[PDB]
């Protein structure tokens, strides 16, 4: 696969793998993902 052409290699999430315009976006990106802790031995 020829490709056509490319530049900076930018940057995306690693749980949605989605780009983003700056790095500095991303980053605060993945906080959505990283929330609550619901795992837990609570078995109720
Ligand atoms: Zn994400």
Not at 12 to 24: A, L, Q
Not at 29 to 34: A, C, F, G, N, V
């Amino acid at each position: 696969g020829s490709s056509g052409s490319s530049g900076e290699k930018l940057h995306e999430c690693s749980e949605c793998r989605k780009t983003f315009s700056f790095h500095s976006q991303l980053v605060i990106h993945q906080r959505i993902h990283t929330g609550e802790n619901p795992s837990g031995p609570s078995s109720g």
